[PDB]
């Protein structure tokens, strides 16, 4: 009975790295984007139903390993490629938390509930990162609507103080290239897109369009403000920046 928990704690830790178990095997069903795990029969049925509680942590971990594979396969130069670079960071710091648990089994011990309350701080972070990644999996977006999508989710989460901080680090690494190509428009009216990574696309006076494949920051009107600054160069709090940035370069 205390022995059947100990080796399954060790098997659970092996899965969470992303590596096949001794008694937990991994079967792809959707191509390992969500893993249909099967733990094989153990003599004690009590420890087997508790082990099942800890396997969806690993299903949500497969969601993020396909996120960082997904944007690389397309070779973007977009801010979606950089959204994944953050999820690789949250993925590097995760690994320290499993490896500690691993260290704790070597000498000294962790029972199943000793496992349970240490996993418990990060299965909640995983599930918020997993749902941003599955909503994004449609083979979209290019620059501006990636940003539009992540802002709505930050304005959703409002009042759970938890995801305000986690969505805070994601939305500023996503904005790290975006405010580059923003400046190029408000001080020179020039474009800097490898693809189309900036909402105001181009093709004097010039033939500007906007697309809703790159939806504006929250509001359509401030994207229209940047339409009107750049012509003149040719001859919550973030959309707010624009309205007075126009009107000091008018």
């Amino acid at each position: 009975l205390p022995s059947q928990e100990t080796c399954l704690v060790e098997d659970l830790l092996y899965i969470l790295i992303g590596v096949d178990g001794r008694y937990i095997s991994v079967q792809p069903l959707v191509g390992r984007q969500s893993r249909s795990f099967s733990v094989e029969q153990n003599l004690d049925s009590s420890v087997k139903e508790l082990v099942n509680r800890i396997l969806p942590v690993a299903t949500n971990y497969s969601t993020v390993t396909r996120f960082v594979e997904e944007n690389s396969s397309f070779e973007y130069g977009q801010v979606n490629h950089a959204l994944g670079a953050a999820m690789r960071t949250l993925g590097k710091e995760y690994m320290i938390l499993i490896s500690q648990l691993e260290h704790l089994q070597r000498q000294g011990l962790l029972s199943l509930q000793k496992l349970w309350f240490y996993i418990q701080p990060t299965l909640r972070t995983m599930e918020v990162l997993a749902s941003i990644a599955t909503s994004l999996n449609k083979g979209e977006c290019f620059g501006g609507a990636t940003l539009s999508l992540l802002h709505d989710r930050t304005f959703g989460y409002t009042g759970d103080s938890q995801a305000q901080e986690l969505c805070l680090y994601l939305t500023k690494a996503a904005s790290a290239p975006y405010f580059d190509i923003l400046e190029r428009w408000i001080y020179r009216g020039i474009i800097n897109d490898p693809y189309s990574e900036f909402m105001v696309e181009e093709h004097w006076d010039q033939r500007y369009t906007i697309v809703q494949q790159q939806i504006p920051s929250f509001l359509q009107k401030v994207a229209d403000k940047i339409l009107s600054t750049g012509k003149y160069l040719n001859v919550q709090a973030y959309v707010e920046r624009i309205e007075k940035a126009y009107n000091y370069a008018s």
Partner: protein
């Protein structure tokens, strides 16, 4: 077990383990022959094998670094930049083994976080050698020009180190030809080739051309034609290049006004 924790170290230097292998160009996977119940702790060390595979593509590149004098001037300056990051990669192998000899046992999962910081670095060096098969200069300048427009901030730092040493022979060509009118070629790796017919006393005549198919992409096409006019008349750090050719253009025209005084 402890013998496996050591064994994975060697595969980082690209040196075949103390167990028999049938991989070294596929990955660097080891088959002990009792790999069956090592299918969970062999699987951890099969993820680490894949790091040692990516080390070997950089290493065989460095066997092509220096021949009896390898083709290109930029082709090897690139290779110098790729060996530097290999040198830093070795630094963590040299602390790792020295921990495996103190008064010993270092956990497989502990060393996995140690190999994760090289795994975002070496992988993007091995991606950068995939775009290049030729060594001919200016190809290499289009590789790093193609990789500093891409996303992800962490390899963007790495390619900015490499931009600084790939580009450095481009700029060593450039500033001699603007000021004195003097050139360098070793293989025709400059984007200026010389003698279309034969040399002729200066009055501005067709003698140099942009030679697109080895142009460094650092310059735009009207700016490569600008520095051509500058070089006949005398006769991101990608965006600092177009600024000072505009400041060169004004100093070379005083020289061109001196040619009127001779006639």
């Amino acid at each position: 077990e402890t013998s496996l924790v050591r064994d994975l170290l060697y595969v980082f230097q690209g040196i075949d383990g103390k167990f028999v292998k049938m991989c070294n160009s596929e990955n660097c996977y080891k088959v002990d022959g009792k790999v069956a119940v090592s299918k969970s702790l062999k699987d951890i060390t099969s993820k680490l094998s894949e790091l040692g595979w990516l080390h070997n593509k950089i290493k065989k590149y460095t066997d092509q670094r220096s021949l009896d004098r390898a083709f290109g001037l930029v082709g090897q300056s690139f290779c110098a930049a790729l060996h530097q990051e290999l040198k830093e990669y070795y630094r963590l192998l040299s602390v790792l083994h020295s921990q495996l000899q103190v008064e010993s046992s270092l956990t497989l999962r502990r060393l996995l976080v140690w190999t994760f910081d090289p795994k975002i670095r070496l992988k993007t060096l091995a991606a950068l050698v995939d775009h290049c098969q030729g060594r001919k200069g200016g190809e290499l300048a289009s590789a790093v020009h193609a990789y500093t427009k891409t996303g992800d901030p962490y390899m963007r730092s790495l390619v900015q180190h490499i931009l600084g040493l790939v580009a450095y022979p481009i700029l060593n060509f450039l500033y001699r030809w603007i000021y004195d009118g003097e050139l360098e070629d070793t293989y025709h790796e400059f984007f200026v080739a010389s003698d279309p017919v034969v040399k002729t006393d200066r009055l501005w005549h067709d003698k140099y051309s942009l030679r697109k198919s080895m142009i460094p992409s650092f310059m735009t096409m009207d700016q490569s034609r600008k520095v051509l006019l500058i070089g006949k008349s005398i006769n991101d750090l990608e965006n600092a290049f177009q600024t000072k050719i505009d400041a060169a253009y004004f100093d070379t025209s005083k020289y061109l006004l001196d040619v009127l005084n001779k006639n």
